[PDB]
Amino acid sequence: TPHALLLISIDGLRADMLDRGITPNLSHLAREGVRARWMAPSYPSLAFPNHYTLVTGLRPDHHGIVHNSMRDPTLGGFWLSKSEAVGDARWWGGEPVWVGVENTGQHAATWSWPGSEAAIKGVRPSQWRHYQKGVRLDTRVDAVRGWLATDGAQRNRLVTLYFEHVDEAGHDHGPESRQYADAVRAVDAAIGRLLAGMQRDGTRARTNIIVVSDHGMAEVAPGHAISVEDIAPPQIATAITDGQVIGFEPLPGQQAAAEASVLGAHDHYDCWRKAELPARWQYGSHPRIPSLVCQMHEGWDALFPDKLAKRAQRGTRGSHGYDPALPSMRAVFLAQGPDLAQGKTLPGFDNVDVYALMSRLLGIPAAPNDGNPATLLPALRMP
Ligand SMILES: [Zn+2]
Ligand SMILES: [Zn+2]
């Protein structure tokens, strides 16, 4: 039988957290296999746009998942907890790896992965779940274990897994916190038990592993939250999203009015017309992107006024969603298996390239994507 692919995301694991003695199992995974120095997220450096980049090889700007939170005249609103929008296929552009795996008559098993609850291009994974917070570490790890072990023509060629606990630890206390490091150990620990259980099940040697994060993490010092209204007053323009990438739409007759006040630079943020965003971000053309886009500077948030008053008064926190070239925003990429190289290190690379690699490990044709196949050929054992 051909070798299965286990794709693991650790949400918000930053590229340098592999080097702090707090990741015994993942460090050993890199000893055994391949570790990129870092992997750069796409713009914007949030969960849904990047997870869905990884699995399609497309920039957010082309796949259409352009924020965690979006509107679309035709399809309506979109946010992470809006289950009828997340599980609605018209939002999700291109073809993610599980669709491609299914269409060759092999099988995909998704614990969680953004897009995996929708029938994208008419196709849903062979195994899947609705997303629920609080699901126990052991719970998700034993179904993944099961889903690799299953045999015959109901064998799973792709198993995906997702961990939200680091990102969540990095929001409430920041990336240098005791909590963050502890959450990193807790997930690393759970990856240990997975790998160990795979061995006892005799699936370890049969299975190729890729471990990624969707972005890094930046420290937000206490009191560094302003209001999105400190950027643009309501009667001018509406804040479409808050956090760090703050979209604005002009009120029907303030189109010009809005441009003065918002555009250009300010103490803790900058704003551009969407078609003039920094060219290096490759973002601005998808229709769904609101008309002005403000990027908060590293370590500052802009929040909805009602979200401003509930904010943790005191407390060092964290965010991401910042300039995806920033070193704080760098993600992880490691990989190990029978079909991957041993001992090796790769340079820093763009997260659009992961797809071509995965498409080769899943015996599927790579759909047209924004990445370059050459970047990750050196991860392989073969040519
Ligand atoms: Zn994330
Ligand atoms: Zn997050």
Numbering used by the authors: 44 to 426
The publication says:
Two zinc ions are required for NPP’s catalytic activity, with Zn1 being particularly important for stabilizing the leaving group, whereas Zn2 activates the threonine nucleophile. We found that Xac NPP not only degrades cyclic dinucleotides but also prefers 2′-5′–linked over 3′-5′–linked cyclic dinucleotides. Furthermore, the conserved histidine is required for degrading the 2′-5′ but not 3′-5′ phosphodiester linkage.
Similar to the previous mouse ENPP1 T238A structure, we found a linear 3′-5′–linked pApG intermediate bound to NPP instead of intact cGAMP. In the previous structure, the guanine ring was within stacking distance of the conserved histidine (∼4.5 Å). However, the guanine ring in our structure is ∼8 Å away from the histidine and rotated 140° from the previous structure. This discrepancy suggests that the guanine ring is flexible and mobile, which explains why mutating the guanosine-adjacent site did not disrupt cGAMP hydrolysis. Using cGAMP as a competitive inhibitor of the ENPP1-ATP reaction, we determined that ENPP1WT and ENPP1H362A have very similar Ki values, demonstrating that ENPP1H362A binds cGAMP equally well as ENPP1WT. Together, our structural and biochemical data demonstrate that H362 is not necessary for binding cGAMP.
